[PDB]
Design an enzyme around this catalytic site. Structure first.
Site, PDB file in Angstrom:
ATOM      1  N   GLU A 357      34.480  41.156  11.744  1.00 21.36           N
ATOM      2  CA  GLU A 357      34.841  41.111  10.347  1.00 21.36           C
ATOM      3  C   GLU A 357      34.138  42.243   9.619  1.00 21.36           C
ATOM      4  OE1 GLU A 357      37.205  39.479  10.207  1.00 21.36           O
ATOM      5  OE2 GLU A 357      36.978  37.433  10.936  1.00 21.36           O
ATOM      6  N   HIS A 487      54.337  32.908  15.732  1.00 19.58           N
ATOM      7  CA  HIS A 487      54.765  34.255  15.368  1.00 19.58           C
ATOM      8  C   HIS A 487      56.265  34.426  15.471  1.00 19.58           C
ATOM      9  CE1 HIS A 487      50.595  34.543  16.288  1.00 19.58           C
ATOM     10  NE2 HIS A 487      50.520  35.855  16.144  1.00 19.58           N
TER      11      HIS A 487
END
Ligand SMILES: CC(=O)N[C@@H]1[C@@H](O)[C@H](O)[C@@H](CO)O[C@H]1O
Ligand SMILES: *[C@@H]1O[C@H](CO)[C@@H](O)[C@H](O)[C@H]1NC(C)=O
Ligand SMILES: *[C@@H]1O[C@H](CO)[C@@H](O)[C@H](O)[C@H]1NC(C)=O
Ligand SMILES: *[C@@H]1O[C@H](CO)[C@@H](O)[C@H](O)[C@H]1NC(C)=O
Ligand SMILES: *[C@@H]1O[C@H](CO)[C@@H](O)[C@H](O)[C@H]1NC(C)=O
Lengths: 591, 194
Positions: A357, A487
Site C-alpha cells: 500500500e 470479475h
C-alpha cells in the site's frame, strides 16, 4: 488560434476544474469508508453524481477537438483518454437497459446463496461461508456440492443476462470505433508514440500468447507435482495422467492454488518463516510497521512520507464504534493528500502488505508533478506490479535480519527455501493460465468466435487443454460458469493479473541487477541501494505521460513483456520439480 | 513621527484574493523593519533590491504594501523574472524591483474543514499583465474565433476560479498569505523611516 492551441487551453481549464472536483469526490468517499453512516453514504453518492455529470459533459466537449490535428503526443494522450465516451456513446435507452442488466447481475452474485442438500435449513452464502469451505474442506463430496451448487443457482440465472450484455457491449464498442468489446478492453495497452515505441492493441494477444508459450513448462511441472500430492488426499478420484477436478483447488474457481499448500508442502517438518511472534514479542505497533516501511523506501532513495500521510490516514481499526471496511487501500486525493486505509494487525502479512500500500502511495507521489490526466501508472499492470515488488524485497530473510525480526544467526536452507518458493508458485504460477485462459474465452466470445450454444463446451475444452482442469459434473449450454466469477459478472477486465505478474519480475530483476545483487533472484533485497531507487523513480515519475513501452525500457532495458525474469525467479523450484517428476507423467490427457 | 501601520496590514483578519490584490500606501511614518525580520514566523522573506537589515535606518518616500492570499505552491512566482499562472495573469513584479516578498502559511485561518472556496484567481487573460497591473474584469474569455456573447461554451470560458483550500491538503496546495513591499526614492519629500 489553431485547433491544437485551443485544445491546450481547453485542457488547462479541464485539469484545473477536474482536480478540484476529484478532491471533493474522494474526500466524500473517505468520510464514508472511515465513517460508515447513512448520511455519509448520502454525501458520497451526491458527490459521485456530480463527478459523473461533470466528466460526461467535459468528454462530449473534448471530442470537439479532433485527435488528428494534435501534433503533441503528450497532449494527444490526455485528449484521447478524455475523449472516449464508452457507455455514453451508446444511445440512451440501451444505456438504461444495460445498466439494469449489470446492476441485476451484481445483486445476484452478492445475494447468491446455495443450500446444502443434507441440511437445507442450513443453507449458506458465498462470501461469508462458502469461501471458507472451499479453502479448508478436505472432503470431496461436500466440496463438490458447493462447486456445483454455486454454478447451478448462479450460473443458470446469469446465462440470459450475460448474453444481452455481450450484445449491448459489443454494439457499444462498435459505436466507439472498436470492432468488439474485447478490443475495447485491449485498448488500454494501445500506446502510440515515438516510432518503434508504439503499441497496437493487437500485439497484446500475440505477446500474451508467446509469453505463455515460455511459461507452459514450469506450469506443467507444478501441475504434475501438485496432482501427485493431491492423489494421496483424494485417492479414488484423481487420474495420475488426467486434469484435476475443478473444485479441489482451494478456491471456488481454482484461481489460486494457495490453499493447497497444506496438502502439497514439500518438506513439512521445516515450517515456514513467520515473524509474527517476533513482532509481537517486541511489542510492535501498526505505526511501527508503517515507519519500518517508510525507512525502507527512504533507504532506496525515495522521499519520506508526507506529514499529511503521517497526519490523516486510518492505519488501525478505529475501535470507537464507527463501522469501516477492513480492506487495505492506498489513496490519492488529488491535491497532495495521500493516505492509506488499512485495518492493520500485528502479523507478518500486514507487515508485508503495508509495504506495498505504501508502494502505491509512493507511485502516487512520484507522478503527481504530471497534469491530472497523466496521473496514473503507465497501464493497468504497473500500479500493483510496482507495489508487490516492495513486499518481495521485504520478505527476504536477509531483510528480516537487517531490521531485527530475525535472529542474527539464521539458518536459510534448501528445504525451507523450496517450501517458500513453492507456496509462491501455488499463488503466482497457479493464476497465470487460469487468468490467460479466462480472458481468452472472453476475447473470443466478443469476437463472436464462440457461438452461443457451445459456450460451456468451448469454455471447458479450453479449461481441459490450457489449465488442465476437469469439469466434474458435465455442464451443457444452459449452464454459465464464467459468470460465477466476480470479475466476469461485475464487468471487469482480467488480463491485468497476467501482465502485472509478468512485469513485477522484470522490474525486480532490473533493480536487483542494478543493486549489484549476487545470487538467486529470489533472495534479492534492494534496501540501502539508491542506484536502484533513482532508476525506479526515473520511470515512477512518468505516469501515463510516456508510452508504457518506454516507461518499461527505462527500468528493465527491454520494450516488452519477458518471462525470463519470472522463470529466473522460480528456477530453483523448476529444477527441483523436474527432477522430482522423472518417474511420473508430465502433461494432461484431455479426457 | 508616528508609526507605520504595518501591524494593521500584516495582522489583518481578512485578505483579498490574488486577482484583486489589496494595496495600501504608507506615508508619514516611522517603523521598525528589523521587527518584521526579527519575527521569523514567516516561511518566505526574500527582500530584493536591498538587504533587509540596511533599510531600518534609511528613510523612504513611498511604500506600497500589497497583500493577498495565494496557493503555497505558487509563492515562488511572486518575484522578478517569474512567469507562472499567478505572475502571468495575476500579479507580476517587474525586473528592476527594489522591495520585499514576505509570506507565511495561513492554514489555520484561511482553511476550512470542508472547504473555503472564497478565494479566487484568474486563469485566462488575453495578454500578460504589465508590472503591478491589477485586473478584475469578469469578462468571458474568448479563445475561439467564434465570439461568445455572454454564454460560456466551448472555446469561450469564464476567467476566474476558486482556490478551495482544505486543512488536509499538501503544503504546496495550502493557503499562504503574502505581502509585497515596494519602495520609491524618486519623489522629493521622503516620509517613511526607522
Ligand atoms: C514535443 C513538445 O511539443 N513538447 C511539449 C513541451 O516542450 C512543453 O514543455 C510541454 C508543456 O506545454 O508540452 C509538450
Ligand atoms: C461520523 O459521521 C457522523 C455523521 O455521519 C458525524 O456526526 C460524526 O461526527 C462522525 N464521527 C467521526 C469520528 O468522524
Ligand atoms: C524527511 O527527512 C528530511 C531530512 O532529515 C527532513 O528535512 C524532512 O522534514 C523529513 N520529512 C518530514 C515530512 O518531516
Ligand atoms: C542498511 O545500513 C544500516 C546501517 O549500516 C544497517 O543497519 C542495515 O542493516 C542495512 N540494511 C541492509 C538491508 O543491509
Ligand atoms: C501581529 O500580532 C502578534 C501578536 O499580537 C505580534 O507579536 C506581532 O508583532 C504583530 N505583527 C505586527 C506587524 O504588528
Amino acid at each position: 488560434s489553431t485547433i491544437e492551441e485551443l485544445a491546450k487551453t481547453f485542457l488547462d481549464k479541464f485539469n484545473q476544474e477536474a482536480e478540484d472536483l476529484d478532491h471533493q469526490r474522494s474526500l466524500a468517499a473517505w468520510n464514508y469508508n472511515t465513517n460508515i453512516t447513512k448520511e455519509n453514504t448520502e454525501k458520497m453518492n451526491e458527490a459521485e453524481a456530480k463527478w459523473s455529470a461533470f466528466y460526461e459533459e467535459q468528454s462530449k466537449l473534448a471530442k470537439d477537438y479532433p485527435l488528428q490535428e494534435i501534433q503533441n503526443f503528450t497532449l494527444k494522450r490526455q485528449l484521447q483518454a478524455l475523449q472516449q465516451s464508452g457507455s455514453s456513446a451508446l444511445s440512451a435507452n440501451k444505456r438504461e437497459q444495460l445498466n439494469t442488466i449489470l446492476n441485476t447481475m451484481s445483486t445476484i452474485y452478492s445475494t447468491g446463496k446455495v443450500c446444502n442438500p443434507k441440511k437445507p435449513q442450513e443453507c449458506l452464502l458465498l462470501e461469508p461461508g462458502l469461501d471458507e469451505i472451499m479453502a479448508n474442506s478436505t472432503d470431496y463430496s461436500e466440496r463438490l456440492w458447493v462447486w456445483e451448487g454455486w454454478r447451478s443457482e448462479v450460473g443458470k440465472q446469469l446465462r440470459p443476462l450475460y448474453e444481452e450484455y455481450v450484445v449491448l457491449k459489443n454494439e457499444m464498442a462498435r459505436a466507439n470505433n472498436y470492432e468488439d468489446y474485447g478490443d475495447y478492453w485491449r485498448g488500454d495497452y494501445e500506446a502510440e508514440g515515438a516510432d518503434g515505441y508504439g503499441y497496437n492493441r493487437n500485439q497484446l494477444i500475440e505477446d500474451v500468447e508467446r509469453t505463455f508459450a515460455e511459461i507452459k513448462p514450469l506450469y506443467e511441472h507444478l501441475h504434475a507435482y501438485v496432482r501427485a500430492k493431491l492423489m494421496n488426499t483424494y485417492p479414488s478420484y484423481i487420474s495420475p495422467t488426467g486434469c484435476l477436478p475443478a473444485h479441489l483447488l482451494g478456491d471456488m474457481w481454482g484461481r489460486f492454488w494457495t490453499n493447497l499448500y497444506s496438502l502439497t508442502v514439500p518438506f513439512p517438518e521445516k515450517p515456514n518463516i513467520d515473524v509474527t511472534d517476533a513482532m509481537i514479542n517486541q511489542n510492535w505497533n501498526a505505526v511501527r510497521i508503517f515507519k519500518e516501511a517508510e525507512k525502507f523506501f527512504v533507504s532506496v532513495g525515495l522521499p519520506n512520507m508526507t506529514q499529511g500521510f503521517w497526519e490523516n490516514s486510518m492505519l488501525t481499526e478505529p475501535t470507537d464504534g464507527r463501522k469501516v471496511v477492513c480492506h487495505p487501500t492506498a489513496w490519492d486525493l488529488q491535491k497532495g493528500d495521500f493516505r492509506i486505509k488499512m485495518c492493520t494487525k500485528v502479523t507478518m502479512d500486514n507487515f508485508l502488505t503495508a509495504h506495498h500500500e505504501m508502494g502505491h502511495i509512493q507511485y502516487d507521489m512520484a507522478y503527481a508533478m504530471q497534469p491530472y490526466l497523466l496521473r496514473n501508472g503507465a497501464n493497468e499492470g504497473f500500479h500493483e506490479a510496482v507495489g508487490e515488488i516492495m513486499s518481495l524485497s521485504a520478505s527476504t530473510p536477509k531483510h528480516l535480519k537487517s531490521i531485527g525480526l530475525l535472529p542474527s544467526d539464521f539458518r536459510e536452507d534448501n528445504e525451507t527455501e523450496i517450501n517458500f518458493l513453492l507456496k509462491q508458485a501455488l499463488t503466482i504460477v497457479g493464476t497465470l493460465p487460469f487468468t490467460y485462459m479466462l480472458e481468452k474465452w472472453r476475447w473470443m466470445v466478443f469476437k463472436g468466435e464462440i457461438p452461443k450454444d457451445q459456450w460451456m463446451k468451448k469454455w471447458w475444452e479450453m479449461k481441459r487443454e490450457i489449465v488442465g482442469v476437469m469439469e466434474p459434473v458435465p455442464h451443457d449450454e444452459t449452464y454459465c460458469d464464467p459468470a460465477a466469477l466476480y470479475h466476469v459478472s461485475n464487468d471487469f477486465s482480467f488480463i491485468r493479473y497476467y501482465t502485472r505478474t509478468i512485469y513485477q519480475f522484470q522490474f525486480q530483476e532490473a533493480l536487483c541487477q542494478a543493486a549489484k545483487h549476487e545470487g538467486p533472484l529470489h533472495k534479492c533485497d534492494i534496501s540501502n541501494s539508491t542506484e536502484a531507487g533513482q532508476k525506479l523513480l526515473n520511470m515512477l515519475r512518468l505516469g501515463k505521460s510516456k508510452p508504457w513501452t518506454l516507461a518499461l525500457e527505462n527500468v528493465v532495458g527491454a520494450r516488452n513483456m519477458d518471462v525470463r525474469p519470472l522463470l529466473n525467479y522460480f528456477e530453483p523450484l523448476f529444477g527441483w520439480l523436474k527432477d522430482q517428476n522423472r518417474n511420473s507423467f508430465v502433461g494432461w490427457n484431455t479426457d | 513621527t508616528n508609526l507605520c501601520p504595518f501591524g494593521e496590514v500584516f495582522n489583518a483578519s481578512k485578505f483579498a484574493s490574488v486577482y484583486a490584490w489589496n494595496r495600501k500606501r504608507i506615508s508619514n511614518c516611522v517603523a521598525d523593519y528589523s521587527v518584521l525580520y526579527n519575527s521569523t514566523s514567516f516561511s518566505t522573506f526574500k527582500c530584493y533590491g536591498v538587504s533587509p537589515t540596511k533599510l531600518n535606518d534609511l528613510c523612504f518616500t513611498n511604500v506600497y504594501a500589497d497583500s493577498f492570499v495565494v496557493k503555497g505552491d505558487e509563492v515562488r512566482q511572486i518575484a522578478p523574472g517569474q512567469t507562472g499562472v499567478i505572475a502571468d495573469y495575476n500579479y507580476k513584479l517587474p525586473d528592476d524591483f527594489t522591495g520585499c516578498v514576505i509570506a507565511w502559511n495561513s492554514v489555520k485561518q484561511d482553511a476550512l474543514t470542508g472547504g473555503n472556496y472564497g478565494y479566487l484567481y484568474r486563469l485566462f487573460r488575453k495578454s500578460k499583465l504589465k508590472p503591478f497591473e491589477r485586473d478584475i474584469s469578469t469578462e468571458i474569455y474568448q479563445a475561439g474565433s467564434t465570439p461568445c456573447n455572454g454564454q460560456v461554451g466551448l472555446n469561450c470560458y469564464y476567467p476566474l476560479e476558486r482556490y478551495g483550500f482544505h486543512p488536509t491538503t499538501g503544503v504546496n496546495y495550502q493557503p499562504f498569505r503574502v505581502v509585497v513591499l515596494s519602495f520609491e526614492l524618486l519623489n522629493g519629500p521622503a516620509t517613511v523611516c526607522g
